[PDB]
Amino acid sequence: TVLQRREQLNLWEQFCSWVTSTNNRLYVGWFGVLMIPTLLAATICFVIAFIAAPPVDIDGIREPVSGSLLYGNNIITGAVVPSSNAIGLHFYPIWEAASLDEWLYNGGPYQLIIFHFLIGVFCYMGREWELSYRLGMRPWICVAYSAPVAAATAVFLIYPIGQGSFSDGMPLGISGTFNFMLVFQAEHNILMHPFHQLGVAGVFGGALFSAMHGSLVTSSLIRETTETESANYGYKFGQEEETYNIVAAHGYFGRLIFQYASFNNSRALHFFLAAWPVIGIWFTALGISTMAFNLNGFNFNHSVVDAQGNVINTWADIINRANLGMEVMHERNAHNFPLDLA
Amino acid sequence: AIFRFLLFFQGFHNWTLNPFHMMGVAGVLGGALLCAIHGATVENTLFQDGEGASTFRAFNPTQAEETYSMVTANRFWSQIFGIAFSNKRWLHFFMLFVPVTGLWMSAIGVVGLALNLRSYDFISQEIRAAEDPEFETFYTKNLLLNEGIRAWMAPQDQPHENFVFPEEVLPRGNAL
Amino acid sequence: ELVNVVDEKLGTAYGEKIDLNNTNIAAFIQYRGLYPTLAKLIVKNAPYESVEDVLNIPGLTERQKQILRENLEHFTVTEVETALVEGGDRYNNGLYK
Amino acid sequence: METLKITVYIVVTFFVLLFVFGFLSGDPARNPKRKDL
Amino acid sequence: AELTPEVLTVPLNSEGKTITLTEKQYLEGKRLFQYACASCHVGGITKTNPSLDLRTETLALATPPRDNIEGLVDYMKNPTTYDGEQEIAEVHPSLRSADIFPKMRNLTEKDLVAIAGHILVEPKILGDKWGGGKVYY
Amino acid sequence: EKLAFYDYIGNNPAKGGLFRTGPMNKGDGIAQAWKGHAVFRNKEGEELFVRRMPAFFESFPVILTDKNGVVKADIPFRRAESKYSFEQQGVTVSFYGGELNGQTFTDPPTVKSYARKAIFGEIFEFDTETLNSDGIFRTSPRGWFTFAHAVFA
Amino acid sequence: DQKLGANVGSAQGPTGLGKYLMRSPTGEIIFGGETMRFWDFRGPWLEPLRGPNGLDLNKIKNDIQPWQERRAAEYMTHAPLGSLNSVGGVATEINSVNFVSPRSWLATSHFVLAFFFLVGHLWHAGRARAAAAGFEKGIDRESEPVLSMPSLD
Amino acid sequence: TLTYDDIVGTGLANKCPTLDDTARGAYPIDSSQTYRIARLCLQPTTFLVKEEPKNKRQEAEFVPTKLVTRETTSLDQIQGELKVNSDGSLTFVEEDGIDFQPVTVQMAGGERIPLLFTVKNLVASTQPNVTSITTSTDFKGEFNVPSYRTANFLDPKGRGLASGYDSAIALPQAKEEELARANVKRFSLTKGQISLNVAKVDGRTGEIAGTFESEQLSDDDMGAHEPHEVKIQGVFYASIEPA
Amino acid sequence: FGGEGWIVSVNNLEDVVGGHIWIGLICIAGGIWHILTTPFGWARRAFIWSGE
Ligand code: CLA
Ligand code: CLA
Ligand code: CLA
Ligand SMILES: CCCCCCCCCCCCCCCC(=O)OC[C@H](COP(=O)(O)OC[C@@H](O)CO)OC(=O)CCCCCCCCCCCCCCC
Ligand code: HEC
Ligand SMILES: CC1=C(/C=C/C(C)=C/C=C/C(C)=C/C=C/C=C(C)/C=C/C=C(C)/C=C/C2=C(C)CCCC2(C)C)C(C)(C)CCC1
Ligand SMILES: CCCCCCCCCCCCO[C@@H]1O[C@H](CO)[C@@H](O[C@H]2O[C@H](CO)[C@@H](O)[C@H](O)[C@H]2O)[C@H](O)[C@H]1O
Ligand SMILES: CCCCCCCS[C@@H]1O[C@H](CO)[C@@H](O)[C@H](O)[C@H]1O
Ligand SMILES: CCCCCCCS[C@@H]1O[C@H](CO)[C@@H](O)[C@H](O)[C@H]1O
Numbered sequence A: 001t002v003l004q005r006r007e008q009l010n011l012w013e014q015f016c017s018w019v020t021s022t023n024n025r026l027y028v029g030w031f032g033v034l035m036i037p038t039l040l041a042a043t044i045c046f047v048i049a050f051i052a053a054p055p056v057d058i059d060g061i062r063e064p065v066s067g068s069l070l071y072g073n074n075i076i077t078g079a080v081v082p083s084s085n086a087i088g089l090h091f092y093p094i095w096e097a098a099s100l101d102e103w104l105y106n107g108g109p110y111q112l113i114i115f116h117f118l119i120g121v122f123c124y125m126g127r128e129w130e131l132s133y134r135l136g137m138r139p140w141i142c143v144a145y146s147a148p149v150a151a152a153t154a155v156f157l158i159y160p161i162g163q164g165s166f167s168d169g170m171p172l173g174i175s176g177t178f179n180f181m182l183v184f185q186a187e188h189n190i191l192m193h194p195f196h197q198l199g200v201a202g203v204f205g206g207a208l209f210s211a212m213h214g215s216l217v218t219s220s221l222i223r224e225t226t227e228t229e230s231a232n233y234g235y236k237f238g239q240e241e242e243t244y245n246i247v248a249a250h251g252y253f254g255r256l257i258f259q260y261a262s263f264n265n266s267r268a269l270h271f272f273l274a275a276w277p278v279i280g281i282w283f284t285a286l287g288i289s290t291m292a293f294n295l296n297g298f299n300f301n302h303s304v305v306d307a308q309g310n311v312i313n314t315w316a317d318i319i320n321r322a323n324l325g326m327e328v329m330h331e332r333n334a335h336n337f338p339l340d341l342a
Numbered sequence B: 001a002i003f004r005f006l007l008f009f010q011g012f013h014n015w016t017l018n019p020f021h022m023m024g025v026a027g028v029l030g031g032a033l034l035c036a037i038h039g040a041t042v043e044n045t046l047f048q049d050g051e052g053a054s055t056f057r058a059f060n061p062t063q064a065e066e067t068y069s070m071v072t073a074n075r076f077w078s079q080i081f082g083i084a085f086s087n088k089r090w091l092h093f094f095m096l097f098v099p100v101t102g103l104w105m106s107a108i109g110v111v112g113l114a115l116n117l118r119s120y121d122f123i124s125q126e127i128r129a130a131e132d133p134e135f136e137t138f139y140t141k142n143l144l145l146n147e148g149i150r151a152w153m154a155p156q157d158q159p160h161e162n163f164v165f166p167e168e169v170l171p172r173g174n175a176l
Numbered sequence C: 001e002l003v004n005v006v007d008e009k010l011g012t013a014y015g016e017k018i019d020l021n022n023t024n025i026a027a028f029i030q031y032r033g034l035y036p037t038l039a040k041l042i043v044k045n046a047p048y049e050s051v052e053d054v055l056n057i058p059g060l061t062e063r064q065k066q067i068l069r070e071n072l073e074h075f076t077v078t079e080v081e082t083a084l085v086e087g088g089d090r091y092n093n094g095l096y097k
Numbered sequence D: 001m002e003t004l005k006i007t008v009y010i011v012v013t014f015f016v017l018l019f020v021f022g023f024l025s026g027d028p029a030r031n032p033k034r035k036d037l
Numbered sequence E: 001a002e003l004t005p006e007v008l009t010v011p012l013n014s015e016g017k018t019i020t021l022t023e024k025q026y027l028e029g030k031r032l033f034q035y036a037c038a039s040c041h042v043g044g045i046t047k048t049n050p051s052l053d054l055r056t057e058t059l060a061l062a063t064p065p066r067d068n069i070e071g072l073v074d075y076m077k078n079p080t081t082y083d084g085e086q087e088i089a090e091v092h093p094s095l096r097s098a099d100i101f102p103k104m105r106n107l108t109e110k111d112l113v114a115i116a117g118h119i120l121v122e123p124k125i126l127g128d129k130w131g132g133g134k135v136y137y
Numbered sequence F: 001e002k003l004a005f006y007d008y009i010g011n012n013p014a015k016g017g018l019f020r021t022g023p024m025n026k027g028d029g030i031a032q033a034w035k036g037h038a039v040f041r042n043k044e045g046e047e048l049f050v051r052r053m054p055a056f057f058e059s060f061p062v063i064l065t066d067k068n069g070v071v072k073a074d075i076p077f078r079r080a081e082s083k084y085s086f087e088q089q090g091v092t093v094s095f096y097g098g099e100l101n102g103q104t105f106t107d108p109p110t111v112k113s114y115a116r117k118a119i120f121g122e123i124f125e126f127d128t129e130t131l132n133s134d135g136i137f138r139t140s141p142r143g144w145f146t147f148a149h150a151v152f153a
Numbered sequence G: 001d002q003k004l005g006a007n008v009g010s011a012q013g014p015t016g017l018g019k020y021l022m023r024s025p026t027g028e029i030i031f032g033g034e035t036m037r038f039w040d041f042r043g044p045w046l047e048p049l050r051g052p053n054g055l056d057l058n059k060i061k062n063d064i065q066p067w068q069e070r071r072a073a074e075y076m077t078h079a080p081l082g083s084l085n086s087v088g089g090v091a092t093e094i095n096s097v098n099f100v101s102p103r104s105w106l107a108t109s110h111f112v113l114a115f116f117f118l119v120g121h122l123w124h125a126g127r128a129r130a131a132a133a134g135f136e137k138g139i140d141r142e143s144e145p146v147l148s149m150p151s152l153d
Numbered sequence H: 001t002l003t004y005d006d007i008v009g010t011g012l013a014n015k016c017p018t019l020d021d022t023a024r025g026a027y028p029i030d031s032s033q034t035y036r037i038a039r040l041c042l043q044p045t046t047f048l049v050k051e052e053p054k055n056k057r058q059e060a061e062f063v064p065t066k067l068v069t070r071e072t073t074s075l076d077q078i079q080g081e082l083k084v085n086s087d088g089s090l091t092f093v094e095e096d097g098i099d100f101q102p103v104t105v106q107m108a109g110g111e112r113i114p115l116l117f118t119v120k121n122l123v124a125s126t127q128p129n130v131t132s133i134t135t136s137t138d139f140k141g142e143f144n145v146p147s148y149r150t151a152n153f154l155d156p157k158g159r160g161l162a163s164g165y166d167s168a169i170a171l172p173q174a175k176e177e178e179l180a181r182a183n184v185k186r187f188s189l190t191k192g193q194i195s196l197n198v199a200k201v202d203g204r205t206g207e208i209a210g211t212f213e214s215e216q217l218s219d220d221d222m223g224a225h226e227p228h229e230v231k232i233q234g235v236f237y238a239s240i241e242p243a
Numbered sequence I: 001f002g003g004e005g006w007i008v009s010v011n012n013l014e015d016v017v018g019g020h021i022w023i024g025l026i027c028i029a030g031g032i033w034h035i036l037t038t039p040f041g042w043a044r045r046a047f048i049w050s051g052e
């Protein structure tokens, strides 16, 4: 009781020193204390469910969809299927079910996985801050990673909340992802939404700029090798000198376009490489998260009208015909009334 | 017009199912990932090379020294992700390799679609579903969406065919 | 063998006229004066052995009987088909516009 | 199901308490430079 | 194609008298139809009861006939079921129920005539698209 | 029969699939004989024509027009408002030439089955057992050659 | 449909669940169709129809007032769905109705603002930590922490 | 006494009303007065499914099953005429109510058995000479079991009865005879049987309660496969009132 | 989660008004507290103390 509190207190401090140690092969940290169990729980349940789960009544109409490999799927068609529309947004842990058999029929695995997964990646983001602080780095890698985290959160949590059901969250599978995208286009015209267009500029541009930056640095590597060696051996890990001639690279790119379209400042250049895809993904995540509340893409259906009043179709009206085809066919047994209002 | 082209390729070619398009997607998204992560990593392993709180001025184009710490960046990603770049030349070649290879793979898939040589179906799926009306997957769900796209979009999208689809033949689920 | 009973019914008078024993209630909008008052009475009091039995629905007004006689030429009767009358489908068959 | 519920509640409480008391245990000072925060 | 006086000439009553609407009348009727009616009747259908539409052939078979200006103006004052048997002002906007459907307040006779003219002219422009629903979008 | 066989969409090289492997016979079957030319008529005796499937379409509805392109019959999806069903329109099919020469069918399911084949063009009898054919179209060497060489190029 | 004569309690929908009325997972009587997900909804126009076990079939048959029919119709046709250019309706709607619900405008604006304020929290929290510790401007070349650490392997 | 907010989410909404242990009385029947059942409630407590053995001579047994569709199973708000017959027996003629529930139960080994648990169009009669309903009164009757899916229901390949494709469109040149049973949808209509054993009677209020056993076929997936035989046991409640 | 909804479920003005009585008194009490006190040791060691 007396000095025993100090033997407990230094033991706590030893644990804190181990948790926050810069010398663990994989950094643990306080965020890792939450991240490690939740990612393991989500991974284990996902792998078992993807292989072996029985069919799931995703749309609450006693029409179970098979997602697992053992129940007739391959890698492309398989999924962990979202929880039942009868559940809606209700919290459905294992212990709310009368049995594992019931839990499986109703899509319990989906909720367990997405909730542990989302805790896990939020803590993964915090952990990226934490290690940078322990290493004496600047802190903002976690801000770049907030873009994919925002996007995952949009499709697994925000969109279900707005629509009132985790049955409308993105399925954990390849063909289930495409299903989510197609129904999303039918119900929100996401292609005509400027935040998704920014998303596309973000990833098309990110891929462009990745190839550009990669090619320009590779183009100006300083000769340190013979023709029978990979040029990669011309760089030694941790060397102080830069390994390419950025003056040569800038001299190329400034003539490819014009001088002032080219970065000569490596810090400005690398900030741009970070900001462009990150901002594009932020906006497309916000697109999903605001179409979650049914503020949808631009609607120019029948916007062009002739002198008499006849509609003159545009390409927007052709898009509308494709959206209609998906609208009228999706969840073909689930609607009883004329409007799909969520 | 391009958005229409995307949806045409879904409804008629089932192009999302095509592994060459999937490799294209991986290269585009992987390239955007590399763009973001590399830019962010450089900007957050910078050496303090000036006194300003805005750090862009502390770089000199003719300088010999790296402006950021490869050693600290490598340890960070090794401990966060398990692996990290150690070779700056490999890093920048890989940033070329990934999106360039992805776009090349997507082009190969489109060449197949020129001939309607689609990844449209999985035969084993169709044999099972035809014989077993309780068997349903996300793959069969998406084909129904495709069948809707074709029937609802073709009369206006392919006017030279003079399609007239009486309302009774249009595929539709309940109510909608 | 195996037969789709709805397609088969399209080959009977059901495919040509309003079948008082089977057709969904929205079809009564095709002719003047039948919807919704008479349409409801007709569906509720089905089935009918012959079209003229529709005139015997208890409680009809004299005007309603005259309206019905004017529209007997647009009516038919065939045997009740379970697939068309279950599910409340005569009142809402899942078709809108 | 009741036993599983209580078990998970304890497990979650355990890790959350580690997280909270961990970050309370003078975390500003756990850095390589100014350890007197 | 043009919005001509012949297009704008519609039946006034059930006895065959016509009226030629002005282009201003038609455009006012279209604006007022959007203001008070399109929330349920966009494109000539009826969202809360899709069995009944605003096609001229449908209006012609309503009781009393609604395929003319006076019939439609009367409907906007005192709406009935399709067979005329029940008055439905309590659940359908009208001058009679403007206390509970406030968008009908301040609607004049001229306003109702304009709305009716829009309903009769629109299928002359759009054909089966009017009252057709999404199949025709 | 060789001329009729060219007028059949199962020999169109734009009807295949990238992973539908092997000979065309593995799909629709080994062709045995021309069934003859199907002539569809309604109860009024007007000749009707099945709208053929364009290469773009994996599936296609069954719609029949008169010689002027007016729709006269179809196979409906929703039945409750069907106006053009083969049952309502009294559609029959008679065959001229081939195996079924001189035969007329009036049973609506049988007439509809032949109409489904007519969207493919001329109608053939196939051996589907020898190769365990799966009924799904494949491309020809013309298609496979073109694909490989455009890709390699 | 009840006005037309439907017995809405016994009406079986295409799936086997009630077309109009069904049970929540804990037994309460609720509206059917996709709106099964929304059975937690409560509103003054609906609650008069609710009893201890959920929606009350007797009250549904006998006690629905015209003001309730009006309100339900009004709310059905002012659902919070619409386009960025304020075309009310589903995404396939034609132009006609100028409407986006205040709830959509207020929910979307504040999600966007709340999200960027979380980004700003991370930005400024990370920067404040780095600045208090003295490395917000970068790594000291002469005293780089990682160079004094043991290698990971 | 309890309100919706007292009940919501508890599972009580899927339970039928009960009567006290003291309700062992007798409800007098006046043969000159007309009667109705104002509310009939059926709450299943066990679903049994008859096994289908390989040996056509081994007598098959009903085995227990696991409910996987949660507390969505009870029939309630059922009403109808309660006729007094010439011989003093009573005949209940079901008119309306929440008289069906889709139910899926699971056999040992995982096989799922969907069924339309129902008393649709029930006509059930007592023994003769029921001058009062007592804990000795029984009802026996038959009801209709319509197809578990109704005519619009589309299978995963879009095929249906009153809507949908009529062929396997993903197999355009397959032979159709082998797929006829999957392609050509059929609408089942069969008979079920039920017994109600009155165990409690409140003679003052006209309320009765007891146990039921019903037998009916399960879902046949619109003709695609043979249905199973199901036995449902549970409790019932009914309030009788003069009409 | 669904059917509960945390504070978003408040469904009557008596709870709304009474909640603001509590928040008002809590905030006034907390404000008085912080005018009269300085941060405890455990708080001093847990936070960063700077404008940013
Ligand atoms: C010019 C090339 C060519 C073409 C056009 C044909 C054409 C044909 N062949 Mg022949 N064949 C060839 C070369 C070719 N062959 C070669 C080289 C061999 C030895 C292996 C054969 C052995 C052969 C046999 C044994 C048979 C045929 C048969 C056939 C017929 C069916 C073809 C089929 O199903 O393809 C299917 C095509 C595919 C499934 C496409 C494969 C796509 C590959 C796997 C993509 C790989 C992508 C790669 C991994 C990505 C890397 C990315 C990275 C860089 C990042 C068709 C007429 C069949 C026949 O009917 O015989 C009578 C038959 O039985 N061929
Ligand atoms: C909480 C904020 C908010 C919300 C919910 C609304 C909502 C509304 N406004 Mg109001 N308004 C606001 C703030 C807001 N406004 C502000 C700040 C101004 C001064 C400009 C106005 C001035 C104003 C006028 C003059 C009018 C409205 C009108 C309206 C209605 C129609 C809006 C519309 O069509 O927008 C169209 C949508 C856009 C223009 C979208 C812009 C999206 C921005 C650019 C997103 C990016 C911002 C992001 C947070 C920054 C990212 C940082 C970095 C990463 C780049 C709708 C009810 C109209 C109305 O009907 O009045 C009765 C109207 O006439 N508003
Ligand atoms: C803007 C409002 C505000 C702010 C910024 C502060 C700030 C502060 N307060 Mg004061 N306080 C306030 C209002 C505020 N207070 C009010 C209104 C009262 C009256 C009740 C008080 C009474 C009060 C007391 C008694 C004390 C403080 C103390 C402090 C200091 C330490 C706070 C801390 O560690 O919290 C962090 C919170 C914890 C460490 C507890 C655990 C939090 C858990 C783990 C997370 C919960 C998250 C969850 C999502 C919350 C929402 C849901 C939940 C309700 C279920 C800090 C300067 C301390 C101090 O040093 O005073 C001199 C102290 O002892 N405050
Ligand atoms: C909390 C901890 C989380 C741990 C999660 C586990 C992470 C696993 C990371 C990848 C390990 C395998 C790396 C092999 C390859 C390997 O060891 O690379 C090591 C290599 C080291 O690069 P250096 O610069 O040292 O090499 C330069 C010269 O050696 C080149 O010759 O790293 C890279 O090339 C970075 C780019 C590749 C990044 C690939 C990421 C792959 C992500 C996973 C994709 C498959 C998913 C399939 C799912 C079914
Ligand atoms: C929704 C709330 C509506 C609004 C707003 C308006 N109308 Fe309507 N309309 C509605 C319904 C449900 C019905 C059917 C009523 C019934 O039980 O019979 C109607 C019907 C009409 C008709 C009759 C159509 C016919 O074929 O006979 C007309 C002419 C009509 N409505 C016109 C109309 C006008 C002019 C409106 C704006 C002022 C209007 N309606 C608003 C539902 C709703
Ligand atoms: C008005 C109203 C109401 C009421 C309300 C109330 C009463 C409220 C309260 C509230 C509250 C009472 C709140 C609280 C909160 C709290 C919080 C929010 C916390 C936070 C925390 C933090 C942030 C921490 C952090 C950390 C950690 C975790 C670790 C260590 C370190 C640190 C410290 C950093 C009602 C609903 C009835 C109705 C309506 C109206
Ligand atoms: C949901 C849970 C709610 C918890 C609410 C907590 C309220 C406040 C109680 C604080 C209790 C923690 O008390 C905190 O513990 C740790 C370890 O014991 C102490 O010790 C810590 O700080 C010192 C000073 O930086 C470090 O050198 C040391 O490495 C570290 O162990 C802190 O100085 C003390 O402030
Ligand atoms: C009696 C109706 C069925 C017989 C005629 C159907 C159209 S023709 C029929 O089609 C099959 C699929 O292509 C072929 O495999 C088969 O050879 C052919 O007989
Ligand atoms: C690591 C163990 C993975 C658990 C395997 C799946 C649950 S157990 C599995 O369930 C099937 C369906 O009910 C049964 O048919 C089968 O006999 C049984 O083994």
Ligand SMILES: [Ca+2]
Binding pocket: F128, F129, F132, F133
């Ligand atoms: Ca075979």
Ligand SMILES: [Ca+2]
Binding pocket: H135, H136, H137, H197, H198, H199
């Ligand atoms: Ca007894």
Ligand SMILES: [Cl-]
Binding pocket: A179, A183, A329, A330, A331, A332, B141
């Ligand atoms: Cl779907």
Ligand SMILES: [Cl-]
Binding pocket: A334, A335, A336, A337, G032, G033, G034, G035
């Ligand atoms: Cl619905």
